[PDB]
Amino acid sequence: ALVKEEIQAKEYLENLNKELAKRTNVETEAAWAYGSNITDENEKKKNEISAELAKFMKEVASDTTKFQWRSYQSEDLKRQFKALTKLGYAALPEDDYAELLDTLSAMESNFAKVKVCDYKDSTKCDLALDPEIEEVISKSRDHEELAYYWREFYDKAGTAVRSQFERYVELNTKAAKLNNFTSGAEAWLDEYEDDTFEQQLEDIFADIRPLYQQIHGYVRFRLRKHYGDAVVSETGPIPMHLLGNMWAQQWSEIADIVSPFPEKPLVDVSAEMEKQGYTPLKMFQMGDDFFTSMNLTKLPQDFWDKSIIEKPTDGRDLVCHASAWDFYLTDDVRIKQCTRVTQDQLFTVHHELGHIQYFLQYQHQPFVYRTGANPGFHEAVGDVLSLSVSTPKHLEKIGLLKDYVRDDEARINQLFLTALDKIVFLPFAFTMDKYRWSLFRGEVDKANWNCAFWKLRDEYSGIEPPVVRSEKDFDAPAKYHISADVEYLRYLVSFIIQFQFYKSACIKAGQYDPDNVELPLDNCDIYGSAAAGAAFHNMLSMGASKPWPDALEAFNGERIMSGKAIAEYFEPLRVWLEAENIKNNVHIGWTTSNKCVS
Ligand SMILES: *[C@@H]1O[C@H](CO)[C@@H](O[C@@H]2O[C@H](CO)[C@@H](O[C@@H]3O[C@H](CO[C@H]4O[C@H](CO)[C@@H](O)[C@H](O)[C@@H]4O)[C@@H](O)[C@H](O[C@H]4O[C@H](CO[C@@H]5O[C@H](CO)[C@@H](O)[C@H](O)[C@@H]5O)[C@@H](O)[C@H](O)[C@@H]4O)[C@@H]3O)[C@H](O)[C@H]2NC(C)=O)[C@H](O)[C@H]1NC(C)=O
Ligand SMILES: *[C@@H]1O[C@H](CO)[C@@H](O)[C@H](O)[C@H]1NC(C)=O
Ligand SMILES: *[C@@H]1O[C@H](CO)[C@@H](O)[C@H](O)[C@H]1NC(C)=O
Ligand SMILES: C[C@H](CS)C(=O)N1CCC[C@H]1C(=O)O
Ligand SMILES: [Zn+2]
């Protein structure tokens, strides 16, 4: 009978959760060892342990059928059982899972091992993306140099893994269907527990799209003045290599040439950080201080003892893309970051520490609940703090911004700078998953895979490659998350919801009042606010114990993902920018790109 079984089920779940945590700890250690030290031996070890855990997950999913869990009274017990039925890749046959693992590591290791030759010195061929190539992309204003590095990188990080990527799509699809999802798109979207989630994002994106068009138009205008009309056309998509980022996902690195008021201050604290003798250790210590200042949890000793916060100086290959790690014990949390002393890197430190804080806040939950309310929540935490860290208000407090006058023009410069990171990213993030969803769903024939990628980048972002690409090239895997099989919609969601969190945290901190000119949203600093911290504790401690609208409700009483907050933040910029574009007769929109030959 059901009453007695539900008691037994509760006991079954308690033990199983603890067992899953312990088994996952072993897989995580091997995955950490591989990411920190790419070798054939470490690859073998990572993939063999994963195969072993997958085998156990299969047994668990099979064992859930022995319980009448759908009949139970407790929503909590039913939710835990449901989490256990979802196998993901573990649903694949033993041999298929092993092949998928070998395929994934082949792609991630290819990306991590990419080396190019120096533009000026064809004998020096040991430039890696991080930091060598990225330094050039961000700093060089030589369009031919930029285009050289773009082509070299994309050819090696992208085209080189086409066949592996094809097999990955096949096995991802097979796995999804064994879980009775239509494709991997539906498997990923299941994490958001909302059958209208795609439409919700389309609607929010449509509301912000006109603002993006205005920013795009103004940036293109300013780039024409710098590079000339031979490099940048008035009516065409922007050549992406000019945007200060390898993937044109954020444009803040070219702020010095596109800033609204060039005679007024533009915040760039990198030089002051170096001047004051900042180190990676100091940057992480300052992030820790920000969290502890809000009455949130201090970084444990394991973090300091075990984290990797600088690129290793021996000859080893590693994954340098920044990552935060939960080892599912108590207080064993780690970051691996190839940290550099720059402003943007200071934001990245706070982003990664946001993941760490989430791990610490929910470590008391049963294993299945030790994850974000949805994947976007996990990405948003640290970015909320980064928004405060980026303010002139905060940067003056820590002595990184000196002799700053916050007049009307300086404010527009700062809002524009933020928008180059926050608004610009939205169409980029949407296209990363729109692309993969289309391949997962079988909507694009293999013969059209590369130009389907550039078509999307054109349609949504109005950017294009520096050189003509074709189906001989395969450019998508040149982005880390595509080579490493990391869902990207989490970042689009994050960039929307982080403004909901920021706005509410600021109101709570007494730092934002829409009717008080002295308290604008774009200069809010939540440092030292226990009130803002209280809201974070309330939400993060839930982990995934409840559907995400309940986690949002715990923070600020709202239950809906909304574009209201991000639009509110950038409203003063929108008004100024629309007028500035009219004043300067700026062309808005773009013709279809000619840079991908079918
Ligand atoms: C994805 O979707 C798949 C379907 O498209 C699904 O696969 C199905 O899972 C079913 C299990 O839930 C399974 O149903 C069983 O079928 C057995 C015989 O099927 C054979 O012949 C079929 C042709 O008709 C073939 O196509 C199959 O390949 C099989 O060879 C039955 O023998 C079996 O029955 C037993 O179990 C039921 C279930 O009992 C339930 O639980 C309690 C038990 O205490 C009951 O009180 C309760 O009422 C409830 O019914 C018993 O009632 C019964 O007495 C038997 O003991 C069972 O019906 C089905 O075969 C399978 N495939 C197909 C094609 O249908 C996947 O499971 C889905 N995957 C995921 C991850 O969700
Ligand atoms: C990297 O891994 C190899 C074996 O795969 C091991 O011998 C070596 O100690 C590791 N290197 C470092 C720097 O940890
Ligand atoms: C700090 O957090 C604790 C719980 O961690 C809470 O009980 C306490 O009220 C908070 N202190 C302040 C000043 O808000
Ligand atoms: C550094 C983090 C790791 S979770 C990251 O990958 N981000 C943060 C913003 C977007 C995305 C990217 O770099 O592509
Ligand atoms: Zn992240």
Q: Residue 180: CB within 6 Å of ligand 1?
A: yes
Q: Residue 70: CB within 6 Å of ligand 1?
A: no
In angstroms, the Cα distances linking 485 to 185, 464, 482 are 12, 24, 5
The parent domain of residue 483 ranges over: 1-598
CA-wise closest residue to 593 among 234, 243, 239, 241: 239
- Resolution of the determined structure in angstroms stands at 2.0
Count the domains in the chain.
1
**Ligand 3 atom index nearest CA of 537:** 5
CA 297 to centroid of ligand 5, rounded, Å: 18
Would you say 368 and 544 are in contact if contact means Cβ atoms under 8 Å apart? yes
In angstroms, the Cα distances linking 59 to 64, 91, 369, 394, 510 are 9, 10, 20, 52, 52
**Ligand 3 atom index nearest CA of 531:** 14
CA 290 to centroid of ligand 3, rounded, Å: 15
Ligand 4 pocket: which of 321, 339, 425, 430 to mutate (most atoms within 8 A of CB): 321
Ligand having the closest approach to the CA of 71 = 1
Distance CA(45)–CA(31), nearest Å, equals 9
As beta bridge partners, residue 470 has 597
For the chain, first and last CA: distance in Å? 64
Q: Residue 50: CB within 6 Å of ligand 1?
A: no
**Protein residue closest via CA to atom 11 of ligand 4:** 491
CA 453 to centroid of ligand 1, rounded, Å: 41
Distance CA(22)–CA(327), nearest Å, equals 9
Structure-block tokens of residue 270: 């990198």
Ligand having the closest approach to the CA of 87 = 1
Q: Please give the annotated binding residues for Zn(2+), written as ranges.
A: 351, 355, 379
Distance CA(578)–CA(455), nearest Å, equals 27
Give the distance from CA 163 to its chain's centroid.
26
**Protein residue closest via CA to atom 14 of ligand 2:** 37
SS3 labels along 331-391: CCEEEECCCCCCHHHHHHHHHHHHHHHHHHHCCCCCHHHCCCCCHHHHHHHHHHHHHHHCC
Pocket of ligand 3 (CB under 6 A): 295, 530
Distance CA(93)–CA(91), nearest Å, equals 7
DSSP structural state of residue 400: S
Structure-block tokens of residue 258: 């596109």
Would you say 575 and 260 are in contact if contact means Cβ atoms under 8 Å apart? no
Ligand 3 pocket: which of 294, 295, 540 to mutate (most atoms within 8 A of CB): 295
DSSP structural state of residue 325: E
Distance CA(99)–CA(404), nearest Å, equals 57
CA-wise closest residue to 232 among 211, 199, 254: 254
Q: Residue 179: CB within 6 Å of ligand 1?
A: yes
CA atoms within 13 A on the CB side of 80: 25
- Apex CA 307: angle with CA 303 and CA 309, to 5°? 125
State whether residue 326 is helix, strand or coil: strand
CA 383 to centroid of ligand 5, rounded, Å: 9
Would you say 384 and 41 are in contact if contact means Cβ atoms under 8 Å apart? no
Dihedral sign for Cα 138, 139, 145, 149, please: negative
Is residue 352 among the annotated active site residues? yes
CA 166 to centroid of ligand 3, rounded, Å: 52
Pocket of ligand 2 (CB under 6 A): 37, 39, 41-42, 314, 316
**Ligand 2 atom index nearest CA of 37:** 1
What is the secondary structure of 107-153 as a DSSP string? HHHHHHT-EE--SS-TT---EEIIIIIHHHHHH---HHHHHHHHHHH
In angstroms, the Cα distances linking 206 to 200, 308, 426, 581, 584 are 10, 40, 11, 20, 25
In angstroms, the Cα distances linking 119 to 39, 132, 184 are 29, 12, 40
Which listed residue (241, 350, 394, 481) is catalytic? 481
Would you say 326 and 361 are in contact if contact means Cβ atoms under 8 Å apart? no
Distance CA(109)–CA(80), nearest Å, equals 35
CA 72 to centroid of ligand 1, rounded, Å: 20
CA-wise closest residue to 247 among 584, 477, 404: 477
Residue with tokens 């982005």: 479
As to burial, measured by CB atoms within 10 angstroms (0-12 exposed, 13-18 middle, 19+ buried), residue 41 is exposed
Would you say 193 and 548 are in contact if contact means Cβ atoms under 8 Å apart? yes
Ligand 1 pocket: which of 58, 174, 180 to mutate (most atoms within 8 A of CB): 180
**Ligand 1 atom index nearest CA of 180:** 1
- Apex CA 478: angle with CA 472 and CA 483, to 5°? 105
In angstroms, the Cα distances linking 321 to 35, 64, 117, 135, 332 are 10, 37, 21, 15, 20
Q: How was this structure determined?
A: X-ray
Distance CA(368)–CA(413), nearest Å, equals 45
The one-letter amino acid at 327 = F
Distance CA(131)–CA(127), nearest Å, equals 8
CA 37 to centroid of ligand 2, rounded, Å: 6
Distance CA(457)–CA(233), nearest Å, equals 17
Polymer length in residues for the chain: 598
Structure-block tokens of residue 423: 């608004």
State whether residue 406 is helix, strand or coil: coil
In angstroms, the Cα distances linking 416 to 167, 195, 228, 241, 511 are 42, 35, 22, 20, 21
Distance CA(268)–CA(302), nearest Å, equals 33
The one-letter amino acid at 55 = K
**Ligand 1 atom index nearest CA of 85:** 71
Ligand 2 pocket: which of 32, 36, 39, 43 to mutate (most atoms within 8 A of CB): 39
Structure-block tokens of residue 319: 């994954």
What counts of helices (H) and strands (E) characterise the chain? 24, 8
DSSP structural state of residue 595: S
